Structure 1
């Protein structure tokens, strides 16, 4: 298990949590020096539990699939909550079995459905450590519309930060003040599977992507990533989605 406390949190303690989260994900291989997530894991071992504590010390436990860093569900006091999708239903067979009741959220866990449920796109939802404290608090008591927004915050400040050093740094910048994600952040989120695939295909293609990945950069400009010498590959992406899962 990995844990993060908002009470006393700073960029350093958040950095430590994101390190712990990455390190909890198993791999047997690195591709271009980046850990390659496993094709599959059987049984309860598929799921990492993240213990998150709000500023007041209240807690939720979040279930994360270690193959793809996908949040499947969470436990808040004695109630479990899972996304409305087959992978989350499967997860519910292994985690939080001792919850007094299980609620299936009225949406799946992808960004398209969550943004619909929340009534707003990610571009308009501030993220940061304060927003993560809010999100934890929101999830403690069921409210499906409020929970959609909370879950967009939770996913970007945990899973997305684990996947990309740039996103981790963005959240660190937002330790004490929320701000909507940069368009580069949005771009990276949207591109992880694509990038993961191209980095793997580059092995056997002399480091060259079979298909260029289009990203938005820090200055707001749109760029093509064509090979493993890109900063996105050398100094940003931290985990690879196995092509078996693409």
Structure 2
């Protein structure tokens, strides 16, 4: 398991959490020095439990699929909650079985579906450590509309930060003040699967992407990523989605 406590949290402690999260994901291979997530894992070992505590010390446990860093569901007190999707229903066979009741959320874990449930796109939802505190608090008691926004915050401040050093740094900058994600942040989230695939295809193509990936940079300028010498590959991305899952 991995844990993170919002009480006393600072950029350093958050960074240790994201480091713990990355280190909890198994891999047998690195591709261009980036850990390659496994094609699959059988049984309960597929799921990592993240223990998150809000500033008041209240907690939720979030189940994460270690092959793709997808959040499946979470436990709040004696109630478990899962996305309305086959992969999450499968997870519910392994985690939080001792919950007194299980609620299936009225949406899948998809960014488009969550944004629809929340009533707003990611572009408009502030993220940061305070936002994460709020998200944990929101999830403690069922409210599906509020939860959709909370989950948009949670996915970005945990999974996405684990996947991209730039996102981790963006959250550290928001340790004491929330701010909506940069367009670069949204671009990277949207491109993780694409990037993971192209980095793997580069292996037998002399480091060259079979298909360029279009990204928005820090200055808000759209760039083409064509090979593994790009900063996005050498510094930023931290985990690769296995092509067997793409």
- Report the TM range for the smaller structure's normalisation: over 0.9
Q: Could you give the per-residue CA deviations for residues 177-218 of structure 1, whole angstroms, max 9, x where no partner exists?
A: 000000000000000000000000000000000000000000
C-alpha displacement at 1:220, in angstroms?
Answer: 0.2
In 1: Cα distance, 2:147 partner to 2:63 partner = 16
SS of corresponding position for 2:204: coil
Q: Secondary structure at the match of 1:96?
A: coil
Partner Cα separation in structure 2 for residue 63 and residue 213 of structure 1: 30
Residue 222 of structure 1 deviates from its aligned partner by 0.1
Deviation at 1:174, TM superposition (A): 0.1
Deviations 1:38-76 (A, max 9, x none): 000000000000000000000000000000000000000
Take 1:69 and 1:26, find their aligned partners in 2: how far apart are those partners? 11
TM (normalized to structure 1)? Answer: 1.00
Deviation at 1:7, TM superposition (A): 0.1
**Match for residue 83 of structure 1?**
83
SS in 1 for 2:206: coil
Q: Cα RMSD (Å) of the superposition?
A: 0.1
Partner of 2:209: 209
**Deviation, structure 1 residue 24:** 0.1
TM-score, normalised to structure 2, is 1.00
Deviations 1:152-175 (CA, angstroms, capped at 9, x unpaired)? 000000000000000000000000
Task: Tell me, in whole angstroms, the C-alpha distance in 1 between the residues paired with 2:109 and 2:191.
Answer: 17
CA distance in 1, matches of 2:27, 2:75: 26
CA distance in 1, matches of 2:13, 2:241: 26
Q: Offset of 1:128 from its aligned partner?
A: 0.1
Segments of 4+ moved more than 2 angstroms: none
Q: CA deviation at 1:136?
A: 0.1
